């Protein structure tokens, strides 16, 4: 498959100053579970955010920098190289990847954070006319997980 994996808030904020606007361990665990043993594609900025590869999956970074060579990372330099990777590919971030990818992907694993954050980056506006709710599951709250959130899985109609 080719999937978006994203958390965005009630106004489609994904990002502030090159970080998540929220502490939400449960969603990062969601990320682990979904993506372990699989492939992530991310833009250069998001990779700098994470700061190195995530273990136990394939890590692929899209970048115009031809001198990019990072232990444990496969570089690519066009959107088109994505379509050639084997297996289940998660589009991992960030804003620009989602923009370039969102009409191309089979489905999306969105976490909706039921808050309003300050952001400087956003998820593309989308319509539920275009997208079927394969599943919607309320995130569980504790002290360590204190924002309401819902895990959507959408498939292109
Ligand atoms: N909420 C979430 O689920 C989530 C997940 C990840 C990231 N984020 C957020 O997203 C924001 C980052 O988004 P962003 O748009 O600024 O950055 P980004 O998408 O992570 O990275 C963009 C970079 O990717 C490379 N790139 C993108 N398209 C390319 C193409 N077609 N050909 C060659 N290279 C290409 C370029 O790198 P070069 O300049 O090196 O060429 C470009 O500057 C941050 O705020 C971060 O916190 C949110
Ligand atoms: C933009 O920053 C991040 C994006 C992301 C990507 C990300 C996060 N959350 C969701 N729902 N989708 C995503 N694509 C992550 C992330 C980020 O901060 C390091 O943390 C890591 C944990 C520490 C290893 C995991 C994911």
């Amino acid at each position: 498959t080719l999937s978006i994996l994203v958390a965005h808030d009630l106004q489609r904020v994904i990002g502030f100053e090159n970080q998540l606007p929220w502490h939400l361990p449960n969603d990062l665990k969601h990320v682990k579970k979904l993506s372990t043993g699989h492939t992530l594609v991310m833009g250069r900025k998001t990779f700098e955010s994470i700061g190195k590869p995530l273990p136990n999956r394939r890590n692929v970074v899209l970048t115009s920098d031809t001198s990019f060579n990072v232990e444990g990372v496969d570089v690519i330099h066009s959107i088109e190289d994505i379509y050639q990777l084997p297996g289940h590919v998660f589009i991992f971030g960030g804003q620009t990847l989602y923009e370039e990818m969102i009409d191309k992907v089979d489905d999306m694993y969105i976490t909706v954070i039921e808050g309003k954050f300050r952001g400087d980056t956003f998820f593309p506006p989308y319509t539920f006319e275009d997208w079927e709710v394969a599943s919607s599951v309320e995130g569980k709250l504790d002290e360590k997980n204190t924002i309401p959130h819902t895990f959507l899985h959408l498939i292109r109609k």
Side-chain angles (χ1 to χ4, degrees), residues 1-3 39 82 85-91 105-107 109 153:
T1 350
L2 180 70
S3 309
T39 291
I82 297 155
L85 308 152
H88 197 169
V89 176
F90 299 89
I91 300 311
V105 299
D106 312 314
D107 55 353
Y109 300 86
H153 180 219

Side-chain angles (χ1 to χ4, degrees), residues 5-7 19-20 27-28 31 49-50 54 92 98 111:
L5 190 60
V6 82
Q19 302 190 59
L20 294 179
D27 186 54
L28 301 175
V31 156
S49 281
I50 63 172
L54 292 171
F92 198 51
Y98 293 134
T111 310

Side-chain angles (χ1 to χ4, degrees), residues 100-113:
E100 313 167 278
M101 272 337 266
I102 198 163
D103 300 324
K104 301 325 172 169
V105 299
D106 312 314
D107 55 353
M108 321 201 280
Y109 300 86
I110 300 210
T111 310
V112 186
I113 330 272

Side-chain angles (χ1 to χ4, degrees), residues 141-155:
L141 299 187
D142 36 70
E143 230 130 65
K144 261 141 115 110
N145 288 281
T146 78
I147 325 115
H149 60 288
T150 314
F151 292 131
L152 288 189
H153 180 219
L154 305 177
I155 306 175

